[PDB]
Amino acid sequence: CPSRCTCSGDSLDCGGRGLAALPGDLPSSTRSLNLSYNKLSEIDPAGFEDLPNLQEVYLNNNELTAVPSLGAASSHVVSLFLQHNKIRSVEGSQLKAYLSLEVLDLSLNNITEVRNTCFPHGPPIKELNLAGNRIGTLELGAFDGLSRSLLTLRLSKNRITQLPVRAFKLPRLTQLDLNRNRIRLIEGLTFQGLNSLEVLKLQRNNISKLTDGAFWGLSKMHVLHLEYNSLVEVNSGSLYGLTALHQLHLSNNSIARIHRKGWSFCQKLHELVLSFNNLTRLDEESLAELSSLSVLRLSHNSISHIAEGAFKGLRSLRVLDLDHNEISGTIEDTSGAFSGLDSLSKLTLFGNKIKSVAKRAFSGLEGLEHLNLGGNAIRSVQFDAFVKMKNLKELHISSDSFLCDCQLKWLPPWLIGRMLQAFVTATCAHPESLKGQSIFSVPPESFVCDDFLKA
Ligand SMILES: *[C@@H]1O[C@H](CO)[C@@H](O[C@H]2O[C@H](CO)[C@@H](O)[C@H](O)[C@H]2NC(C)=O)[C@H](O)[C@H]1NC(C)=O
Ligand SMILES: *[C@@H]1O[C@H](CO)[C@@H](O)[C@H](O)[C@H]1NC(C)=O
Ligand SMILES: *[C@@H]1O[C@H](CO)[C@@H](O)[C@H](O)[C@H]1NC(C)=O
Ligand SMILES: *[C@@H]1O[C@H](CO)[C@@H](O)[C@H](O)[C@H]1NC(C)=O
Ligand SMILES: *[C@@H]1O[C@H](CO)[C@@H](O)[C@H](O)[C@H]1NC(C)=O
Ligand SMILES: [Cl-]
């Protein structure tokens, strides 16, 4: 066993020793070899006999300028970790010898380009990680040599600008990671050739336009990440072919309206996240085709108008997030905004502009167990406003704007009797003989209006 290195079983730890050369002097039984955090500028391939057990090799955080040759031991290496070196190019002639290579980490290097010759037919790579380089050019078919084996491909934090039609022929890839690049636009059929794809990450690009058929071919995809882009809308045609889609993440875009037609193409959707956008209204049946949808997140928009039947068709919905919008009149005057939401369990309207609560506002919310009306300056609640919600077990209220007249008299004893007083902070604004006092502190007969007609 090496002088400065440490031997525990079949693992050999030479990491953080500060070596420029390789010790070796390498035990035949060595399976794991940690050479990371040294100052290696190169590797001498003659140092790697005899090592029939060599499977894992850690060469990250060194000064390597190319992918190295492990000599006689190359063809048995299963995982090769090369991240945080100074490698500028990947040489297919050097990867040819790695006939057992399954994991290859090339992240955080100085790679600017990938050509076809970089990844030839040879090494059966399952996971290729190229994240955090400066890749700004991909030849058409760059990874196609790895098609029979490649399952995961990470291209995060590069400088990729566009993708051609039918960019990849990688029919077994299950995850493609293209986030934090510079893609502005996805053309039609860009991702055809990715039959097995399950997860596509396209967030933190500059995507302004999804072409019709942008994602056609991705019929097995379950998750699509499009957060932090520049979409002002989601065109119906752009969703065509996403039949197996379960999660759509559109947060932190600029989406100002949603079209109904597009939801027909992903009916098996389960979670839709449209939070942090610029929506102002929700129109009738605009979501009707999403009948398997379970979770809908619409918080941090500017929604002020919710049409009657806006949520019709959503028979599967369980969680509705409408926090931090501009909602007011919906809960004050409108009836039927929530019809079709019989199955709904949780609904939150925290931090809106609601001043009063009407009985008719909650038409269609009978299954509700959780209601959040906190962060609203509510002045009054109509008598038995929550009568249809027999299953309501949690009710959040936080207002110091209450008018404590005869119209509010019913609320404290009803809340206490339903075990709903725990999450209610309710303070009286008027009358002035009751200001600042808790809704529960006020004596029952102190709640009075003007009865000018002596009855
Ligand atoms: C959308 O973007 C906003 C920022 O523009 C994200 O907000 C936050 O960032 C951290 C994550 O929770 C918090 O510590 C910050 O306080 C919070 N900032 C603001 C201004 O709210 C938000 O999480 C993003 N959401 C999604 C789904 O992408
Ligand atoms: C590898 O060596 C580095 C450098 O000291 C150390 O931080 C790390 O924990 C080691 N890991 C393994 C698996 O040996
Ligand atoms: C990164 O790669 C480029 C390619 O020419 C090179 O000029 C630059 O010096 C590299 N950076 C470092 C820190 O070596
Ligand atoms: C994204 O594209 C738009 C289109 O004009 C423009 O702001 C610029 O090219 C890009 N902006 C950023 C911040 O990358
Ligand atoms: C989107 O809404 C945010 C606040 O909700 C606002 O600051 C921003 O200017 C809006 N953008 C557009 C393009 O309307
Ligand atoms: Cl991210």
Neighbours of 2 (CB within 10 A): 18
| Residue 374 tokens, joined | 């906190």
Which atom of ligand 3 is least distant from the CA of 86?
Answer: 14
Domains of the chain (ranges; CATH) run 1-322 (3.80.10.10), 323-455 (3.80.10.10)
Q: How many CB atoms lie within 10 A of CB 247?
A: 16
Of all protein residues, the one whose alpha carbon is nearest to atom 13 of ligand 2 is: 34
Q: Mark residue 137 as left, alpha or beta (left: phi above 0; alpha: psi -120 to 50; beta: remaining).
A: beta
Identify the nearest ligand to the CA of 32 by its number: 2
Q: Are 308 and 332 in contact (CB under 8 A)?
A: no
Structure tokens at 290: 């999403």
Could you tell me if the CB of 299 is within 6 A of ligand 1? no
Residue 228 CA, closest ligand 1 atom number: 28
Ligand 5: which residue has its CA nearest to atom 13?
254
- 13-27 burial, b at 16+ Cβ within 10 Å, e below that, comes to bbbebebeebbbebb
How was this model experimentally determined? X-ray
Rounded distance, CA 255 to CA 275, Å? 10
Distance between CA atoms of residues 133 and 302, nearest Å: 38
Which mutation among 179, 225, 252, 274 tests ligand 1's pocket best, with the greatest number of atoms within 8 A of CB? Answer: 252
Q: How many CB atoms lie within 10 A of CB 453?
A: 5
How far is 282 from 272, CA to CA, in rounded Å?
Answer: 15
Kindly report the protein residue whose alpha carbon is nearest to atom 2 of ligand 3: 110
Residue with CA closest to ligand 5 atom 1: 278
Gap between the Cα atoms of 276 and 298, Å rounded: 8
The DSSP bridge partners found for residue 81 are 58, 105
SS3 annotation, the chain: CCCCCEEECCEEECCCCCCCCCCCCCCCCCCEEECCCCCCCCCCHHHCCCCCCCCEEECCCCCCCCCCCCHHHHHHCCEEECCCCCCCCCCHHHHCCCCCCCEEECCCCCCCEECHHHCCCCCCCCEEECCCCCCCEECCCCCHHHCCCCCEEECCCCCCCCCCCCCCCCCCCCEEECCCCCCCEECCCCCCCCCCCCEEECCCCCCCEECCCCCCCCCCCCEEECCCCCCCCECHHHHCCCCCCCEEECCCCCCCCECCHHHHHCCCCCEEECCCCCCCEECCCCCCCCCCCCEEECCCCCCCEECCCCCCCCCCCCEEECCCCCCCHHHHCCCCCCCCCCCCCEEECCCCCCCEECHHHHCCCCCCCEEECCCCCCCEECCCCCCCCCCCCEEEEEEEEEECCCCCCCHHHHHHHCCCCCCEEEEEEECCCCCCCECCCCCHHHCCCCCCCCC
**Which residue's CA is the closest to the ligand 5 atom numbered 2?**
278
User: What single letter denotes the amino acid at residue 24?
Assistant: G
Pick from 367, 429, 354, 339: nearest CA to 397: 354
What is the whole-number distance in angstroms between the Cα of residue 109 and the centre of ligand 3? 9
53 lines ligand 1 (CB under 6 A): no
Is the preceding peptide bond at 451 cis, omega within 30 degrees of 0? no
Resolution, Å (one decimal)? 2.3
Among 337, 319, 426, which residue's Cα sits nearest to residue 381? Answer: 426
Number of other residues whose CB lies within 10 A of the CB of residue 379: 18
